[PDB]
Write a structure and sequence with these properties.
Length: 340
């Protein structure tokens, strides 16, 4: 490990509080893609020129064209990438990738199979896995390892700020710091939790309270800290119980409550390390209305993550909105501070 004196930031766009993406460039000259920075995965992919326009997703996203890059290096190894919500398929390529100020040689997937559902609903083109080589499909070096290799980053850490949505155009949707934190976006002190293990951004969670009573994960459980999850997620059994406690009806893909009932819904806490991390109903309800007649989604849903990572809680954007999160690869731990 070699440390320099460079901090590098990635400005992020907040789509509807569910999609947080920033811009990278690939090739000479650069081709730009909107990408989700996903601690729950370890590959880079963007859609490919070689994707059939029979995938309507590829018609509606930026496509990497290797025939327009003078820094492309062929590989052509196939790979399938499996995500919580959908699956993509293609082949491996090498090129120069620009992220913040930093230029790195990176192996990445050219995706050629991009299902209409759900990629038609994606503001973003691709994904930059911020996880560990142990999770990388085709055991490819993840972009963060490659930047650390360059010995320019002041620290072997990266931090996430996820703003609330804003009408105002001049609002900052989010910020990734590579090699640091931005003290302009948190307050009080970081509180750290060491990982179950190296190779996954997962930590021991002691309890979930719904207002008064610890009626979930009573013994102890797993929390994946997943900058690529829109929501906080537990396992079908954890949730259909959580929601029964809240008084929430179960729709096909999410839980809802009558909008009128939303604001008085109880606090939800998360025992991580020392501190108890609490969310108000404001923090976990899409309060889009106050009418008893209309229905309001909650930012918590069922996610059955398969082993060996699963089953686990996923703490995504619902949680990171309140808690500025610092991923410390140096000491294998996650820092949390109160966001501002
Ligand atoms: C693809 O890259 C891998 C890993 O760096 C390399 O060892 C392999 O031989 C490459 N395959 C081709 C066909 O270029």
């Amino acid at each position: 490990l070699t440390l320099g004196n460079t901090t590098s930031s990635v400005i992020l766009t907040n789509y509807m509080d569910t999609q947080y993406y920033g811009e990278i460039g690939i090739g000479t000259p650069p081709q730009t893609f909107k990408v989700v920075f996903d601690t729950g995965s370890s590959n880079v992919w963007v859609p490919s020129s070689k994707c059939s326009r029979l995938y309507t997703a590829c018609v509606y996203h930026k496509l990497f064209d290797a025939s327009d890059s003078s820094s492309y290096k062929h590989n052509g190894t196939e790979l399938t990438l499996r995500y919580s919500t959908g699956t993509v398929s293609g082949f491996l390529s090498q090129d120069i990738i620009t992220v913040g100020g930093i230029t790195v040689t990176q192996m990445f997937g050219e995706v050629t199979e991009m299902p209409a559902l759900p990629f038609m609903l994606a503001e973003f083109d691709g994904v930059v896995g911020m996880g560990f080589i142990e999770q990388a499909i085709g055991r490819v070096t993840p972009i963060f390892d490659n930047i650390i290799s360059q010995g320019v980053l002041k620290e072997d850490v990266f931090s996430f700020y996820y703003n609330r949505d804003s009408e105002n155009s001049q609002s900052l949707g989010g910020q990734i710091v590579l090699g640091g934190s931005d003290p302009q976006h948190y307050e009080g002190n970081f509180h750290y939790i060491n990982l179950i293990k190296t190779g996954v951004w997962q930590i021991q969670m002691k309890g979930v309270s719904v207002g008064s009573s610890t009626l979930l994960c009573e013994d102890g459980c797993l929390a994946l800290v997943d900058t690529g999850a829109s929501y906080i997620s537990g396992s079908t059994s954890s949730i259909e119980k959580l929601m029964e406690a809240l008084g929430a009806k179960k729709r096909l893909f999410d839980y809802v409550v009558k909008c009128n009932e939303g604001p008085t819904l109880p606090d939800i806490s998360f025992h991580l390390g020392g501190k108890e991390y609490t969310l108000t109903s404001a923090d976990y309800v899409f309060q889009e209305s106050y009418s008893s007649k209309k229905l309001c989604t909650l930012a918590i849903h069922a996610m059955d993550i398969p082993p060996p990572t699963g089953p686990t809680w996923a703490l995504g954007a619902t949680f990171i909105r309140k808690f500025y999160t610092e991923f410390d690869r140096r000491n294998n731990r996650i820092g949390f501070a109160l966001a501002r």
